[PDB]
Amino acid sequence: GMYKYIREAWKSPKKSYVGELLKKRMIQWRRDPVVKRIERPTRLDRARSLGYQAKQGYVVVRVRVRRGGRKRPRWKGGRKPSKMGMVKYSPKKSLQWIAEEKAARKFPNLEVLNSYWVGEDGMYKWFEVIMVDPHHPVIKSDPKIAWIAGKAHKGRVFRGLTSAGKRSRGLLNKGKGAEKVRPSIRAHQGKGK
Amino acid sequence: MKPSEIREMSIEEIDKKIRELRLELAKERGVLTMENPMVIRNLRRDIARLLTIKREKLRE
Amino acid sequence: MDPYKVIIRPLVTEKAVSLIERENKLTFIVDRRATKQDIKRAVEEMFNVKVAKVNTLVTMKGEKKAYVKLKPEYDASEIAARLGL
Amino acid sequence: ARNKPFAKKLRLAKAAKQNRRVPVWVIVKTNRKVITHPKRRHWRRTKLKE
Amino acid sequence: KPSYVKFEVPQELAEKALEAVEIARDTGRIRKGTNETTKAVERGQAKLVIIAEDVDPEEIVAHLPPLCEEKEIPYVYVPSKKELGAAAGLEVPAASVAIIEPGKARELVEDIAMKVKELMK
RNA sequence: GCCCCGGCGAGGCGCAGGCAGCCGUCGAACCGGGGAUGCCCGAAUGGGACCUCCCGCGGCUUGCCGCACUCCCAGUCGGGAGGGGGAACGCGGGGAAUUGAAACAUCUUAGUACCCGCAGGAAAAGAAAGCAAAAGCGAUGCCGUUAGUAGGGGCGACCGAAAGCGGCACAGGGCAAACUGAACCCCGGGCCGAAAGGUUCGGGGGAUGUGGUGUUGUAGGGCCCGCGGAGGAGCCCUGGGGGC
RNA sequence: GAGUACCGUCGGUCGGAUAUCCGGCGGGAAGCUGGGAGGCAUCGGCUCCCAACCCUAAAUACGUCCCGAGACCGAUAGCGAA
RNA sequence: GUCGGUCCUAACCCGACCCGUAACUCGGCGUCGGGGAAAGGGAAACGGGUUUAUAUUCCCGUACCGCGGUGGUAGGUGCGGC
């Protein structure tokens, strides 16, 4: 018990008690810094499903990002008209992945495992990010995570091996439609996505 | 100078010997500027042998 | 600096010999990284004399030259004879 | 009086020592093969990089 | 005060209740933790649910009061998690505890039950 | 260029055909293996750099060790991690114009050149919410064909696949939850041991759940009834033979 | 296994054409009496599957190094550099 | 030790924290700290001789500054002048 009720409360905040708590919490979170370590997760069901254990070596961080798309700098040389746009552009990475990269940048000895949405403003989105210390003995002893101290797993978030990166690389499709995403985007001349 | 002869002795004799050899090397380098033109080389290499053996005696 | 590691050469030139026999002074080529205290101690321990004054210069061959004045109770010429010259 | 920095002085001293002709016993030992090398520098002709 | 608190209890109860918890341990049966407690209500075994007030995030214990009213099981609040854990025999804190099979503390429970019924209605 | 262990077996002292000399038969030079010394700057890290040089704190006894920033475990003691470099190959983002279209604006050049970030000896992918069509297949990746085909396109110039078929190589495992509820993990010291790893004191975590269970299609698992109780495959090397 | 599957709209990208993938904005489920796909949408049949969490060798690419070989050059050649 | 640099600030520059950027060796930023003048501010040495070639730097003569000691005294507890 006790996990389904959290799930059901967060399935639609407006329709429950979570809306008002989030309004107050946002009032406070807007004062905080962009990246901030916290003690306990806000959504425990979602964290423990993406992999979170109450042990030494697990760290939780909250990250604030600005909403919307991107605006390109003005071209200084001559351009053709199809090449002139500035204002209506979107990033090919998602805001989740961008938040994870910010957290990674501020904690240089840890590795990102996953992340989850924790609220929205008119100006801002908030995500919570789970990190692991690979060189801690508890971690090196628990065999559900002990893979994370291998050579091939540093820079994980920067190379796109977290779940948000996989989604933005198109690796949740398998058959018809997915011809140009496997094994890499670079492998098919950048032509997917 | 040979390492067997250097390994029979005590660190204090080794130290006295380094002092003496350094003084000789300075004197010879002074006259050189004025019969065995290899004295300087052999003195250098002897000082080196002594320092090696002293270090290995201490590390024990 | 460790004494017995400071002195590299004595000098024997016209200027140096003049200073020996006129001002009770010796002249040595010395390690670049040595100070005047170190030079004083080196000379005093290697030759068992007492020192009055040390002066220094860096040459344009990259070497340090030291001029050492002993106290008048000791003669620079006896140490000069103890050295090669 | 002319106010040099010590490291610049030491580099100029090396450049000074570098500048001489090949020794004669080297030419003899080599049987007239090595007789000139690429770094004869004169102070009016070719300037160094300070 | 958080939003999962529906009335302000006075100290003497909270003082009564910790005892009831400590007692029923040395003698009777105790469930510790929100998961163990939540299952005991869903099943209908609890006589008293005890709930702390220093809980953040509130998500964890916000579902109990409405779930108890349904099954008509009574509940009282305490101010500390750390005390509620110690009483129950734990080196760690606890956010919820449920009394089941109370021994030697029956007529504390049935009294704590009555005082909080008016304090709710 | 200093020391040692083995080999070789008399000369040796770099490119480098000299004058003087020295080392070597107490086994050198040379070759294989292993140690010592190792100035200054440099990520450069006790603090500062218009000159790869300067200026300090402590504490122990001149001689010595320690004193950067960001973070984890902690905790007023300490134990750890990161930073920089690397030809080509690798992953993820940002992204032109010349040119061709016999001009040129959609198009092309091109997801190219170049820019930013992140890894390794390989990386990435990977165990069907798939492919198919009256038959069936069975994780991923690579090679040959499918094919200048389906299809896109001022339907212009041009662009452009996949399934299938033939081969190389093969391999499948684990969480969340339901149920249980401290039965759990880590650090240090006292012991036993070749060791796999046991056992004791003192600490840090953990009921906001450590450990046990369990991991799939009209199915699997849990609970519930019950008859059965071959987890025994791995690891440590006093021993041992063979082979490279 | 939820701001997820799905709808609408904008920008990019693709052979993907009313039927490719990526992102932003506005809406937004069921959840085992359940869910998804089958090249416009929808209704009914039949066939195939169970997403939104994790790891994984071999077959493959490269050669700042080493090794071997050559109807390759032979000092204005051949790497810029014998 | 006494000449100049090693101290101080000027206009100005940099780092950390913080904010932005898909990101950075990119752009900013009040504050904290650190740098920034051999003609600005800023303790203390003059004359004569000596060398092939240096000298307010060596020698002779006569001085000054800072720090640290030793020993005495003024003062603590003393006076002259509207």
CA distances, B5 to each of B23, B54, C77 (Å): 21, 13, 37
Nearest alpha carbon to residue E58 among A126, A42, A2: A42
User: Do the bridges between strand A58-66 and strand A124-132 make them parallel or antiparallel, or are there none, so unpaired?
Assistant: antiparallel
Contact criterion met (CB < 8 Å) for C10 and B26: yes
E33 with E67: CB under 8 angstroms?
no
Quote the minimal CA–CA distance from C4 to chain B in Å: 6
User: Do the bridges between strand E48-52 and strand E75-78 make them parallel or antiparallel, or are there none, so unpaired?
Assistant: parallel
Cα–Cα distance for residue pair A136/A49, rounded to 1 Å: 22
* Cα dihedral A174→A177→A180→A183 (10° resolution): 0
Which string of DSSP letters, residue by residue, matches E34-79? HHHHHHHHHHT--SEEEEES--SSGGGTTTHHHHHHHHT--EEEES
Chains that touch B (3 or more CB pairs under 8 A): C
- What is the side-by-side strand order in the sheet with E48-52? E29-32, E96-100, E48-52, E75-78
Asked if strand F comes closer than 7 Å to A9 Cβ, the answer is: no
Give, in degrees to the nearest 5, the angle at Cα D40 between D39 and D44. 120
Give, in degrees to the nearest 5, the angle at Cα C35 between C29 and C40. 75
Cα–Cα distance for residue pair A167/A164, rounded to 1 Å: 5
Quote the minimal CA–CA distance from D25 to chain C in Å: 24
Residue type, A3: Y
| Block residue for tokens 């552009």 | A89
* A166: nearest nucleotide, CA–C1' criterion: F92
E25 with E52: CB under 8 angstroms?
no
Asked if strand F comes closer than 7 Å to B1 Cβ, the answer is: no
Q: Say whether D32 sits in a helix, a strand or coil.
A: coil
Q: How was this structure determined?
A: cryo-EM
List protein-proximal bases of chain G (any atom < 7 A from a CB): 1-3, 10-16, 20-26, 29-31, 39, 51-56
Nearest alpha carbon to residue A44 among E56, E98, E91, E4: E56
Cα–Cα distance for residue pair A131/C44, rounded to 1 Å: 65
Cα–Cα distance for residue pair A65/C29, rounded to 1 Å: 68
Asked if strand G comes closer than 7 Å to A168 Cβ, the answer is: yes
Cα–Cα distance for residue pair A135/D47, rounded to 1 Å: 56
| Block residue for tokens 């006896």 | C78
B/e letters for E93-111, b = 16+ CB within 10 Å, e = fewer, are: bbbbbbbbebeebeebbee
Nearest alpha carbon to residue E74 among E47, E98, E41: E47
Kindly report whether the peptide bond that precedes residue A183 is cis, defined as omega within 30 degrees of 0: yes
- What is the side-by-side strand order in the sheet with A35-38? A35-38, A58-66, A124-132, A111-120
Cα–Cα distance for residue pair E100/E28, rounded to 1 Å: 8
Who contacts A45 (Cβ-Cβ below 8 Å, separation ≥6)? A3, A4, A6, A7
Cα–Cα distance for residue pair C72/C53, rounded to 1 Å: 12
* A179: nearest nucleotide, CA–C1' criterion: F162
Quote the minimal CA–CA distance from C24 to chain D in Å: 29
Asked if strand F comes closer than 7 Å to A89 Cβ, the answer is: yes
Cα–Cα distance for residue pair A49/B10, rounded to 1 Å: 71
List protein-proximal bases of chain H (any atom < 7 A from a CB): 4, 18-24, 38, 51-53, 55, 57-59
Q: What are phi and psi of C60, to 5 degrees?
A: -95, 10
Phi-psi region of E44 (alpha: psi -120 to 50; beta: other; left: phi over 0): left
Residue C57 near chain D (CB below 8 Å): no
Cα–Cα distance for residue pair C54/A71, rounded to 1 Å: 72
D50 with D8: CB under 8 angstroms?
yes
Residues in C whose CB is inside 8 Å of some CB of B read 4-5, 7-12, 46, 83-85
Contact criterion met (CB < 8 Å) for E59 and A20: no
Asked if strand H comes closer than 7 Å to C77 Cβ, the answer is: no
| Crossing angle of the two packed helices E64-71 and E34-43, in degrees rounded to 10 | 20
Q: Which helix (H) or strand (E) holds D47?
A: none
E42 with E97: CB under 8 angstroms?
no
Task: Dihedral sign for Cα A59, A64, A70, A72, please.
Answer: negative
Cα–Cα distance for residue pair E49/E30, rounded to 1 Å: 11
Q: Say whether D33 sits in a helix, a strand or coil.
A: coil
Q: How far is the CA of A176 from the C1' of F145 (A)?
A: 21
Three-class HEC string of A87-138? CCECCCCCHHHHHHHHHHHHCCCCEEEEEEEEEECCCEEEEEEEEECCCCHH
